Symmetry: D2
Subunit: 115 residues, 4 copies
Amino acid sequence: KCPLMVKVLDAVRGSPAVDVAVKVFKKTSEGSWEPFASGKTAESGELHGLTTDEKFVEGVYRVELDTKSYWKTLGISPFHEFADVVFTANDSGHRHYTIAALLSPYSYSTTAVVS
Amino acid sequence: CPLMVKVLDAVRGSPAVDVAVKVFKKTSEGSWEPFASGKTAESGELHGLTTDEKFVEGVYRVELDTKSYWKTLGISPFHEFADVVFTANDSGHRHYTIAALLSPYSYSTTAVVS
Amino acid sequence: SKCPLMVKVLDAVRGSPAVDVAVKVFKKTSEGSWEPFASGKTAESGELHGLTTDEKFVEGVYRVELDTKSYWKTLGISPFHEFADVVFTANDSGHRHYTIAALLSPYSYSTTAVVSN
Amino acid sequence: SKCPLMVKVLDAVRGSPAVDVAVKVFKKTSEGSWEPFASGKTAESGELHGLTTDEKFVEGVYRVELDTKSYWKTLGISPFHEFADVVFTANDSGHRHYTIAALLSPYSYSTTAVVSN
């Protein structure tokens, strides 16, 4: 039943990325980003329960991982200010989305699983 | 479960289903001998390859048959396969996840070790 | 070279450079908005050179945006992301040279920074 | 530009080229064994050129092995993998030029092939 999940891994430690701050924004008709949902990754590196099928309507979404604070907490000065993932959701029926991310200090990878 | 494999498809945005996986263990003599095998489920995951007791200290080679995967989908891929080779259980007993992200001419792999 | 900001892009589906990828660069203002800084497209090599100089490329927060959506749709492929952007602080301990490398798939991308003195 | 097999490696932890990565190339035989074909180390650019020539780079199954374990150990880091290898058939349908690109982290790597006629 979870329509939008986030999963984050740490490529330096070979572990889930724990305590990663996540902010979701939804684009408005006027074109601005308004706050939609927020949370933190658990011990699993996964974030559940951001939203529900009812609230997760058609629109353009931006998922922002606070990668800078993550690396700095571990004593590492990273390259990026954050990692944004921007996408259109539910444009042709309701789907379930997973945004996965793999983090290094100077690099990240992100994949979408859509079902 | 001490050794899990998880595979994603970057072209379709989905689990990579029915990926054949072969695992080998290096012998004292230096050759690869078969150790375990299976296929990824609809989840893109493969569980139950081995047990904590059977998964002894050694050098392991996990081979994903990426070529068969892409050819089944009507795509001619670059690699013959994707091998992931590593020492396991040399410093305390651990659980490993080998994750893989596949495109026709590219792949990424990560280890989660707990 | 004297080139302080380069972009290199590869296509993971075709096994080739990503050609004619549109790139927009922005610089964060005092008020907290993005103003246009530079723009170009990747060449046959998948690379974009000559975006800026060390005179113009001063200390600040920059945003580099690849139009990944238009790139895939030109090839007949419907991609996941609206775009791929990279946001970073530049030149805050003196001038450096930066390369933003990116690897593209329809539902996935990776980006790496190479920073040199 | 005449170079038929190139290797390019980046370090995702340092944000730099991966320098002095040991590279070994093998070619498969009729009997199914790996015979040595070429070897070298990445330069300060992270690139390795001059491994072979078009005349020597004949049709066959090749194995390119990056010694990632030694690389990380030299930097004081205990890495996950024994190495990173890329196995592929080359020059089966026309003679081509190949670039094997890799991005390294201690517990992760990505590899991409760029093929050009």
